[PDB]
């Protein structure tokens, strides 16, 4: 009684079978029409999707010669209760029902109207996520720039502070040489240049302090954008999945070929 088989899905694509078996338990399966025009069973084992052909000759079916079974149904039903270990090592335990795939609106007008609402909601949430992604990318890049600029400041501060250490080494024995020679105006000159240097270092220290404070603020903004995106991402996938479903139930209900 095939075509009225929860696990039989017809002209379903390999990529569609993949979506339906993604992260499923060993034993999960579905049957479909081969990628030619002939049946292929897809099964989950060891995190992989194994394709098994359903061979046909003289009205008989099976995976290999001899073809023992009368129909595609009898074939599945044997392997639903007995392991594949003989042929080979798991039973066909979890069917992927086409009926369980809910989405219950009766008529074309009702479907069409609902799809229009979903498609609208989908483009709305899409544009929202795309603008969030742009905010996320920009922020992350500016954070990168600030962290490089802070490194550059740290080095500048290191060079400038080494400058003080140098003036401190040289000046000591010259201030002593000028104190003896009573050259108070020259001592004033050495000191004025030293003040000038410490005033510059003081400004460079504040330029970094301000940027480190911008960095703390931008890092927190990033964390928020990340939280806001990790929230939009799963809802958008489902909203897209529903839209694709209402589009499929419309293509099917209407005239085909």
């Amino acid at each position: 009684s095939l075509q009225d088989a929860e696990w039989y899905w017809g002209d379903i694509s390999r990529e569609e079978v993949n979506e339906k078996l993604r992260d499923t338990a060993d034993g999960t399966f579905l049957v479909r029409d081969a990628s030619t025009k002939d049946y292929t069973l897809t099964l989950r084992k060891g995190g992989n999707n194994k394709l098994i052909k359903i061979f046909h000759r003289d009205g008989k079916y099976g995976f290999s010669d001899p073809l023992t079974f009368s129909s595609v149904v009898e074939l599945i039903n044997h392997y639903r209760n007995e392991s594949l270990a003989q042929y080979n090592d798991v039973k066909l335990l979890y069917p992927v029902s086409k009926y369980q795939q809910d989405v219950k609106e009766d008529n074309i007008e009702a479907v069409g109207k609902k799809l229009h609402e979903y498609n609208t909601q989908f483009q709305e949430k899409s544009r929202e996520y795309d603008r969030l992604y742009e905010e996320y990318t920009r922020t992350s890049q500016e954070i990168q720039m600030k962290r490089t600029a802070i490194e550059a400041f740290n080095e500048t501060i290191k060079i400038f502070e080494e400058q003080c250490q140098t003036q401190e080494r040289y000046s000591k024995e010259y201030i002593e040489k000028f104190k003896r020679e009573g050259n108070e105006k020259e001592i004033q000159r050495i000191m004025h240049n030293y003040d000038k240097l410490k005033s510059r270092i003081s400004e460079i220290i504040d330029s970094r302090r301000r940027l480190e404070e911008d960095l703390k603020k931008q890092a927190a903004e990033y964390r928020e954008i990340d939280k806001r995106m990790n929230s939009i991402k799963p809802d958008l996938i489902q909203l897209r999945k529903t839209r694709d479903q209402y589009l499929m139930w419309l293509t099917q209900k209407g005239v085909r070929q």
Partner: peptide, 10 residues
């Protein structure tokens, strides 16, 4: 341009 001389002056 701030120039840092080797004698320690700026």
């Amino acid at each position: 341009v701030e120039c840092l001389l080797p004698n320690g002056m700026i």
